[PDB]
């Protein structure tokens, strides 16, 4: 628990270092879902992953 | 000073000091016209102190007192009005003919027997008095 | 604008008035303020007077458009201009005129910023200005009351407005000699208590007594004026010290005597500790109305409850002496005989109690230390009358099983069954002063004082059998006879009884708890109505006091007695002083802190400052420990004060126990014991949550005796709170035991708490008093202070005889109805217009002959405001026989 | 009852604040919960520390 | 000091979850100028927000309970969000933006406990 | 005003004296404590071993063992030795373990649930009793049904048999159903746990029967108690998905309630108070007695009642003595508590626009004509219907 959002930061930090580059997301179809139950550990990470995507993306 | 006696003593004075301060905030008796007797209190208790700083020529310079103005005769066989390593300097001090043991040669620097002036009298000197033989 | 030259030159414009009421304020904000301050010349001051005509209209208009944003900082500044920029003790005309529109504007801060802190800040500025303006003042009070304009705001404003002259803070002499009292009294009843207290003098009240009498006929009817008098007295109990306060009470009496509205005159009389007042009162009563009427009924009902003629309850002497002349008057064979005494409640109880059946017992366990206790609890539960009397006639059960002091305090309980009855017994305090053995014999004396409660009868003869035994130099007999001597009569002295007590042959350093009885009877006897000014009486206290330093419990007992001497009339405190001075005692120095606190009680002013303090505790010298621990506990305070003050004390007390207990162990033992008895007497707020909560915390605190002392608070409505209180202590008591001693304490706690299943409200309180002074407290109070680890403590502990009633049997104007009356109860109030304990008739309803309950439900109105009935004699579920003036008779039951 | 409720509101607020300080400060004031019968048990307890069989771990 | 897990000093750093939330979503702050000239429109947002937070007394006098629900409704592109930001900054209240999502509820991460 | 003030000033000052007196006791004044307790603490802390690793004490075995679950992640079967007794330990609490080798040193501290913290809200109504008048008959009933069997045992004991176990407060909002629950709870001072019905249906499934059983079970442990279930209409109304709406979700929550209240598992003299604005959503089995006992129905306010209902709203605001109550009864009647709240809010709203910071009769009158129309408009008028 808490490994999932952290992975998002990693991809963003490598991309900016490794210019020129493009990060392309084919399906944000499970990175972002409409339901977050999050009374389950796995479900709680899926919500975190979305939050981090959005905040790093404002900077990028 | 000895620590133990102070600790008993401190507790006593202090507990009172803080309790008195409690009484001061508390006022009801701003309004009254009592002479009928039972109270006749101010119904506030407070305390304070003031003290004066001085104490004359504490140290001559930043360094210890050493020589200082105003002169004294000190008799021999005093060490509760002692001679000091700060007093070699002092000795001399325009000595009087009332001292029948007065300087005749230099200084001894830190302590020793010093020259006694050619005596014509023994009024100022005091007879023999060892504690040697009464020890046992 | 707000600039110069529109109020600083004689060519000017009234222009800023236009801006102010909706735009931005410039004409009470700071233009007026600027000008007054500016220069020193009176010419500028003159230009501000001119502006006022515009300002009056402007002020009502701005009220309708109500912009609170504009009021708040802008009006703060006005305080400067009125007083501090005219001076307004050396220039009269200028602040007189300015107040006409301006006084209302200042009032807006007063109202909007409603807390106590702000009302006092603005008040000081106001008192000097109102006083200077006088006569002008009169116009301004009137203007508000009628209405300034119909708005939500004016309703709040008017009560705040009448208040400002009345504050009397830092008020100078130049126009300060004027009675303001009459207009203020008619219109509003909030401003009036403030005026007495702050004057702290005879005059406020003299002017009040005068005005109240004319109101009798003129303003309304008698009932309404009586009601205003009750609010004033209760709230004026602080900001005035105790000798000063006792005098105010004498001016109140002047009013009652005129009125047919008597009960209040009696409760005040208990405070004074005077026989005299009552004696003058029956004659005055007779004079005003020829008719028996409410005056004769109310006076009768009020005295029976408790007055002054020794230590507790109510005398037979004045009732017997006066009923030659009242026996001559003869308005009833049945009515006047019954009414003077407590008989009508007694008769009803004794019949209901029988049907319901109340054994009024302890445990059913014999031959053990364990039921030393259960002998005593028999008495305690039936300290409001019972029916164990049947088992008691053989006496197999309690008396022989018990030994020592245990046998003594057992045999108090036979008589105890028959207290507040019309027969003192006939086979169980008849023949127990004719039963062999001294422990039963002395202890049946103890019973002999009890059985003469409030009653005029003296059924089984208190004073008789006791007059016999004080002559006898036998110590056991003596102690017993004197306890009864004090218990039977009332709160001070009588001429036959005082003479009698004068020989001492008694105890004076002894271990036994029962030896303490001497100190209480003797201390009261010494103080008189205005002192007897018999020198001998003071001496006898001193004799026992000077001897004792060998026993800490005994050593404590005499200073409390010295304390009782001081209690009473203001002038009486000066008279007694000459006697005290002749001898001197080091013993009297330690004595002073408790002695002061009891004397002080009756007013908060002096009382609070001394209490909850460690001024004579540092606990490194034995003198310091003697009385000081108990003083801290704040026992006296809550009852003396107003009901609002009581609400804050419940919080303070719970923190209090912890503070003392860690601070001193010996103190914890003394202090915590007193804490339980403090809650019962004081009646601080709430009883639903509080005994349950308290039983839990007392487990941490030391001593099994604490639990016993707590159970006293846990009484109140005796089947309401107390069933729970008992069960919770029950668990922990069943939990662990290992010594007979602890088990005995726990046993006292479970049974003492009781008086249950259809049995009425019993708590230490007379119903009518809430201004009342402690003299009914003394028998349990002594027992909280001393060791309760002795079985001996039990004699004094048996009596905590007091009643409240569940009756709501009101006596009509000439109906004299015996049927009950529905009431509404509510815990809290929306106003201090009410503080004579009546709340609205909606609330939650409680019935007729249905449990009367104390705090968080103590306040009581008879619901019947729509039927226009008023109690003359106040309702709370009093011990007194209620009385009403009925403009519609008794209302039936109502569902809800 | 609008003007009457403010007065009461302020008076409680002040009394309530003061309480926070008193409660915290007093505490149990450096006392021991066990009292006198556990003193003998302390000596045992030390022997157990040396011992390898104590502490046990529950499992299934 | 993890040499006994004993408290060394109290830390002068203490992170607030309200600030985080405002940041991750993104609001570029704005002021009255942006719409400026529709005077009535800016004056109304100030009435509701600013006065009952800063001084609660003003509404106490007015009567009506201090703002519970204030509905700002109507389509965006009129700079409706922007005025809200302006008053929220000045008042020193944290403007925590929800875009319709229980994404920014992380304290259990489902609505209806996003109230408590 | 002036009558109150002397006593108010004195109460604040009595409290000041109380604060100040504590400081002297902790710092200087000692008699049993002394230097001696200071040393007792040092000596106990060093033997005990700091850090103490937290455990929870589930139960005590009398032979010198206890069954502890250490909070780190893996549980231990410890001995009860060192500064505590078997009886000194209490169940469902946090305890201190010696860090080096786990034996249970003792209970100083208690453990509160994570659940209870969120649920709980403090007991006291913002509208004082006897000023929630208006249906004044009804207000009394709740004091009799929930508050009384806990406050007074006398009537119940003589009456015999089972006591009450709830009340259901139902009918149109504004008749103050929340204010009533809070009153009885305040008086008794029974822990007041509060959950909105919407928490019973959230995205996760089976959370509803789970939350409700835990809530009750926690009420029994912290007993006596009042559980307030606020506004149970949501069960059917809401859905985050197909599984969250529909029969399974609705049944499970209803079924749990039935077993919990009077059924096998029962409850003590712990009461459940239910607020509902619709018993259309609620079943005939939770409107059944003896797990609800007396039901309280509030009807629409009557012409005379409406004046008393209006007074309550006016008391929260500024107090009127210039509002004509007849105009309100004449214009609308046999409309909710919620309508009287609607007249009040709109008056406050117009005054706000001017920056008038009061309400007067004028603000009530101006707003009153639009509000009556508006009530009808709230439900669709379409194009022209």
């Amino acid at each position: 628990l808490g490994e999932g959002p952290r992975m998002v930061r990693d991809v963003f930090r490598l991309a900016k270092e490794n210019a020129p580059a493009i990060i392309f997301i084919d399906e944000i179809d499970a990175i972002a879902t409409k339901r977050f139950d999050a009374q389950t550990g796995a479900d709680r990470e899926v919500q975190r992953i979305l939050l981090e995507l959005l905040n790093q993306m404002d900077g990028f | 000073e000895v620590p133990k006696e102070k600790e008993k003593e401190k507790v006593s004075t202090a507990v009172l000091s803080i309790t008195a301060k409690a009484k001061k905030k508390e006022k009801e008796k701003e309004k009254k016209e009592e002479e009928k007797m039972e109270v006749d209190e101010a119904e506030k208790k407070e305390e304070k102190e003031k003290k004066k700083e001085p104490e004359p020529n504490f140290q001559l310079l930043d360094n210890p007192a050493r020589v200082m103005p105003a002169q004294l005769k000190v008799l021999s066989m005093t060490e509760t009005c002692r001679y000091q390593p700060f007093k070699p300097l002092s000795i001399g001090g325009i000595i009087i003919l009332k001292d029948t043991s007065e300087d005749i040669e230099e200084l001894v620097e830190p302590v020793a027997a010093h020259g006694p002036k050619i005596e014509e009298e023994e009024q100022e000197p005091e007879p023999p008095e060892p504690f040697e033989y009464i020890d046992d | 604008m707000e600039e110069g030259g529109r109020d600083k030159t004689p060519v000017q414009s009234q222009q800023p008035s236009a801006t102010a009421p909706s735009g931005a304020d410039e004409k009470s904000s700071g233009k007026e303020r600027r000008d007054a301050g500016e220069k020193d010349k009176e010419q500028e001051l003159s230009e501000e007077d001119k502006q006022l005509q515009d300002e009056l209209e402007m002020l009502v208009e701005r009220l309708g458009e109500k912009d609170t944003s504009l009021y708040r900082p802008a009006l703060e500044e006005l305080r400067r201009q009125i007083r501090s920029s005219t001076t307004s003790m050396t220039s009269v005309p200028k602040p007189l005129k300015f107040l006409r529109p301006h006084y209302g504007k200042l009032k807006e801060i007063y109202e909007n910023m409603a807390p106590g802190e702000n009302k006092c800040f603005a008040a000081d500025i106001i008192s000097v200005l109102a006083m200077t303006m006088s006569g002008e003042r009169e116009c301004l009070k009137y203007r508000l009351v009628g209405s300034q304009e119909e708005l939500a705001s004016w309703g709040h404003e008017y009560v705040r407005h009448l208040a400002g002259e009345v504050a009397k803070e830092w008020q100078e002499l130049d126009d300060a000699e004027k009675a303001q009292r009459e207009p203020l009294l008619t219109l509003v009843k909030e401003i009036v208590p403030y005026n007495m207290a702050h004057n702290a003098e005879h005059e406020a009240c003299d002017l009040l007594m005068e005005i109240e009498q004319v109101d009798m006929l003129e303003k309304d009817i008698d009932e309404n004026a009586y009601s205003k008098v009750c609010l004033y007295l209760t709230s004026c109990v602080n900001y005035v010290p105790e000798p000063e306060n006792s005098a105010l009470l004498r001016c109140a009496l002047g009013v009652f005597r005129k009125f047919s509205r008597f009960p209040e005159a009696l409760r005040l009389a208990l405070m004074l500790n005077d026989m005299e007042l009552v004696e003058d009162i029956f004659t005055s009563c007779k004079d005003v109305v020829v008719q028996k009427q409410m005056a004769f009924m109310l006076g009768r009902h009020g005295v029976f409850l408790e007055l002054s003629e020794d230590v507790e309850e109510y005398e037979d002497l004045t009732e017997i002496m006066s009923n030659v002349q009242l026996n001559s008057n003869f308005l009833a064979l049945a009515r006047e005989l019954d009414i003077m005494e407590p008989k009508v409640p007694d008769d009803i109880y004794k019949t209901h109690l029988e049907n319901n059946r109340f054994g009024g017992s302890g445990s059913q366990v014999d031959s053990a230390r364990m039921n030393l206790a259960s002998s005593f609890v028999n008495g305690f539960v039936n300290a409001a009358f019972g029916q164990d009397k049947l088992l008691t006639d053989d006496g197999n059960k309690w008396l022989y099983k018990n030994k020592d002091h245990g046998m003594l305090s057992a045999a108090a309980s036979l008589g105890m069954i028959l207290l507040w009855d019309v027969d003192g017994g006939l086979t169980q305090i008849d023949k127990y002063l004719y039963s062999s053995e001294d422990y039963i014999k002395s202890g049946a004396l103890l019973a002999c004082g009890i059985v003469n409660s409030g009653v005029r009868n003296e059924c089984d003869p208190a004073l008789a059998l006791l007059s016999d035994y004080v002559l006898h130099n036998s110590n056991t007999m003596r102690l017993g006879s004197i306890f009864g001597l004090g218990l039977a009569y009332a709160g001070s002295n009588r001429e036959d009884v005082l003479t009698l007590l004068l020989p001492v042959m008694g105890d004076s350093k002894s271990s036994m708890e029962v030896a303490g009885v001497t100190a209480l009877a003797c201390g009261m006897i010494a103080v008189g109505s205005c002192n007897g000014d018999v020198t001998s009486t003071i001496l006898q206290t001193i004799m026992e006091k000077s001897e004792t330093e060998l026993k800490d419990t005994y050593a404590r007992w005499l200073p409390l007695g010295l304390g009782l001497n001081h209690l009473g009339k203001g002038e009486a405190i000066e008279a007694i002083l000459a006697a005290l001075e002749v001898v001197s005692e080091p013993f009297r120095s330690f004595a002073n802190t408790l002695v002061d606190v009891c004397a002080y009680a009756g007013s908060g002013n002096v009382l609070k400052v001394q209490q909850l303090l460690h001024i004579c505790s540092e606990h490194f010298d034995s003198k310091e420990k003697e009385e000081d621990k108990d003083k801290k506990e704040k026992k006296d305070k809550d009852k003396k004060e107003a009901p609002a003050d009581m609400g804050a004390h419940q919080g303070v007390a719970v923190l209090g126990i912890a503070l003392i207990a860690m601070g001193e162990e010996i103190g914890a033992e003394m202090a915590l014991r007193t804490f339980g008895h403090l809650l019962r007497y004081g009646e601080p707020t709430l009883r639903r949550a509080v005994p349950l909560a308290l039983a839990l915390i007392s487990v941490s605190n030391p001593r099994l005796n604490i639990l016993d002392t707590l159970s006293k608070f846990s009484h109140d409505a005796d089947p309401e709170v107390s069933y729970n209180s008992i069960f919770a202590m029950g668990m922990v008591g069943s939990g662990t035991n290992n010594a007979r001693l602890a088990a005995m304490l726990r046993q006292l706690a479970q049974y003492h708490a009781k008086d249950p299943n259809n049995l009425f409200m019993v708590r230490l309180a007379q119903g009518l008093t809430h201004l009342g002074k402690g003299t009914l407290t003394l028998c349990p109070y002594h027992s909280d202070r001393q060791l309760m680890s002795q079985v001996a403590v039990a004699g004094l502990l048996t009596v905590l005889v007091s009643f409240l009633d569940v009756r709501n049997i009101i006596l009509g104007k000439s109906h004299y109805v015996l049927y009950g009356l529905v009431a509404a109860m509510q815990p809290r109030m929306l106003v201090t217009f009410d503080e004579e304990l009546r709340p609205l008739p909606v609330s939650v309803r409680v019935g007729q002959a249905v449990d009367v309950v104390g705090q968080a439900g103590k306040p009581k109105t008879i619901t019947g405001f729509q039927t226009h009935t008023t109690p003359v004699l106040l309702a709370h579920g009093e011990r007194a026989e209620l009385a009403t003036e009925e403009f519609l008779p008794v209302t039936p039951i109502l569902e809800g | 009852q609008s003007t009457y409720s403010r007065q009461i509101k302020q008076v409680e607020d002040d009394i309530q604040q003061l309480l926070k300080k008193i409660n915290e400060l007093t505490g149990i004031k450096e006392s021991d919960t066990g009292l006198a019968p556990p003193a003998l048990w302390d000596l045992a307890a030390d022997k157990q520390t040396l011992q390898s069989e104590q502490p046990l771990q529950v499992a299934r | 000091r993890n040499d006994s897990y004993t408290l060394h000093k109290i830390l002068p750093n203490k992170v607030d979850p309200l600030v985080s939330l405002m940041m991750v979503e993104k609001v570029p702050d704005s002021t009255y100028e942006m719409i400026g000239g529709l005077d009535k429109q800016i004056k109304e947002i100030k009435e509701v927000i600013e006065l009952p937070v800063k001084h609660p007394e003003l509404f106490e006098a007015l009567g009506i309970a201090q703002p519970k629900g204030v509905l700002l409704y109507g389509p965006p592109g009129t700079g409706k969000t922007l005025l809200a930001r302006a008053v929220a900054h000045h008042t020193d209240c944290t403007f925590i933006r929800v875009s319709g999502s229980e994404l920014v509820q992380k304290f259990i991460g489902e609505g209806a406990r996003m109230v408590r | 005003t002036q009558c109150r003030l002397k006593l108010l000033k004195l109460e604040r000052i009595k409290d000041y004296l109380l604060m100040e007196e504590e400081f002297i006791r902790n710092q200087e004044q000692m008699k049993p404590l002394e230097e001696k307790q200071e040393e007792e603490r040092s000596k106990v802390d060093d033997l005990r071993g700091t850090p103490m690793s937290v455990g929870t004490l589930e139960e005590i075995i009398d032979d010198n063992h206890a069954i502890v679950s250490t909070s780190v992640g893996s549980e231990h079967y410890v001995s009860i030795l060192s500064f505590v007794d078997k009886d000194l330990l209490e169940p469902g609490c946090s305890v201190l373990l010696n860090h080096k080798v786990h034996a249970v040193i003792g209970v100083l501290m208690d453990d509160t649930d994570p659940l209870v913290t969120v649920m709980k809200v403090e007991k006291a109504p913002q509208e004082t009793y006897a000023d929630i008048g208006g249906l004044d008959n009804q207000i009394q009933e709740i004091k009799e049904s929930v508050e009384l069997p806990l406050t007074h045992p006398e009537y119940y004991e003589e009456m015999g048999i089972k006591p009450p176990k709830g009340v259901i407060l139902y009918g149109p909002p504004g008749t103050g159903k929340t204010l009533l629950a809070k009153a009885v709870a305040n008086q008794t001072s029974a822990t007041f746990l509060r959950v909105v019905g919407s928490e019973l249906i959230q995205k996760y499934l089976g959370d509803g029967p789970k939350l409700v059983r835990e809530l009750f079970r926690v009420a029994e442990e912290h007993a006596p108690s009042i559980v307030f279930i606020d506004e149970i209409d949501a069960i059917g109304t809401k859905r985050y998905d197909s599984n969250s709406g529909g029969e399974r979700e609705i049944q499970r929550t209803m079924l749990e309630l039935l077993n919990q209240l009077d059924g096998f598992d029962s409850r003590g003299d712990v009461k459940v108070i239910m607020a509902t604005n619709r018993i259309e959503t609620l079943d005939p089995a939770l409107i059944r007695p003896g797990r609800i006992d007396r039901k309280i129905e509030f009807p629409l306010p009557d012409e005379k009642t409406k004046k008393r209902i209006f007074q309550i709203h006016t008391s929260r605001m500024t107090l009127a003595d210039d509002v004509t109550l007849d105009d309100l009864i004449m214009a609308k009647d046999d409309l909710s508590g919620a309508d009287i709240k609607a007249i009040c809010t709109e008056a406050g709203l117009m005054a706000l626009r001017e920056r008038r910071m009061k309400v007067t009769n004028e603000d009530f009158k101006k707003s009153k004509e639009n509000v009556l129309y508006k009530k009808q408009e709230g439900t669709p008028e379409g194009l022209y219907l």
Side-chain angles (χ1 to χ4, degrees), chain C residues 570-756:
Chain C
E571 315 196 44
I573 296 154
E574 179 77 302
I576 63 189
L577 178 72
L580 271 71
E581 206 179 315
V582 186
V583 294
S584 280
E585 289 181 312
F587 308 102
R588 186 178 316 157
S589 313
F590 56 73
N592 286 345
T593 58
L594 179 76
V595 154
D596 281 339
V597 151
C598 64
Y600 297 171
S603 288
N605 178 106
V606 48
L607 185 64
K608 177 71 274 185
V609 186
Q610 203 79 255
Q611 291 190 125
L612 185 68
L613 201 66
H614 293 247
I615 193 59
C616 289
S617 283
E618 288 165 53
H619 25 285
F620 298 131
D621 168 75
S622 301
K623 300 199 145 170
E624 290 187 294
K625 299 179 199 194
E626 293 277 25
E627 264 83 44
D628 222 72
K629 319 306 197 199
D630 181 26
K631 116 191 179 302
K632 304 193 193 313
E633 190 58 49
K634 312 135 298 187
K635 195 264 183 299
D636 283 72
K637 184 159 169 64
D638 311 330
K639 189 141 192 178
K640 314 293 148 59
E641 304 303 83
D645 196 286
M646 300 195 173
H649 202 91
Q650 185 68 86
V652 169
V654 57
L655 268 56
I657 57 178
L659 190 152
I660 215 286
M662 303 197 181
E664 286 92 63
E665 44 192 298
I666 296 191
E669 174 190 80
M670 196 181 194
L672 286 43
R673 285 183 310 208
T674 298
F675 160 77
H677 173 49
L678 140 64
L679 299 178
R680 192 183 186 148
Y681 183 49
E683 59 164 305
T685 199
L686 203 45
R687 292 191 171 233
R688 278 71 175 84
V690 201
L692 283 301
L694 264 45
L696 312 155
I697 56 150
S698 57
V699 177
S700 315
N701 305 114
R703 283 84 177 186
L704 308 314
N705 322 122
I706 313 308
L707 289 176
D708 200 7
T709 62
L710 291 162
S711 294
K712 292 186 178 193
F713 180 42
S714 312
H715 273 67
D716 201 46
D718 292 280
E720 181 165 8
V721 299
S722 185
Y723 283 152
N724 310 267
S725 291
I726 288 161
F727 300 155
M729 288 183 186
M731 184 160 169
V732 198
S734 291
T736 304
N737 183 66
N738 298 103
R740 213 171 200 142
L741 195 285
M744 191 171 74
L745 262 304
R746 298 159 203 251
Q747 194 68 327
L748 287 168
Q750 326 297 348
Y751 286 86
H752 162 67
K754 296 200 170 178
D755 185 61

Side-chain angles (χ1 to χ4, degrees), chain B residues 62-123:
Chain B
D62 201 78
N63 282 343
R66 301 150 182 181
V67 173
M68 202 61 83
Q71 304 174 77
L72 289 288
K73 288 157 191 296
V74 290
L75 295 77
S76 193
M77 221 169 303
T78 53
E79 300 189 297
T80 196
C81 302
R82 74 289 191 252
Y83 292 84
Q84 298 161 268
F86 291 99
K87 270 177 184 294
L89 306 178
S90 298
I91 295 293
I94 56 276
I95 200 158
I96 315 297
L97 285 288
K98 187 266 162 290
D99 305 291
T100 206
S101 295
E102 60 170 74
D103 300 275
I104 42 171
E105 297 205 286
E106 315 189 294
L107 234 293
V108 284
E109 310 186 325
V111 295
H114 186 93
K117 173 190 47 173
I118 311 177
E119 297 188 327
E120 67 274 300
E121 48 182 66
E122 308 304 328
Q123 311 313 298

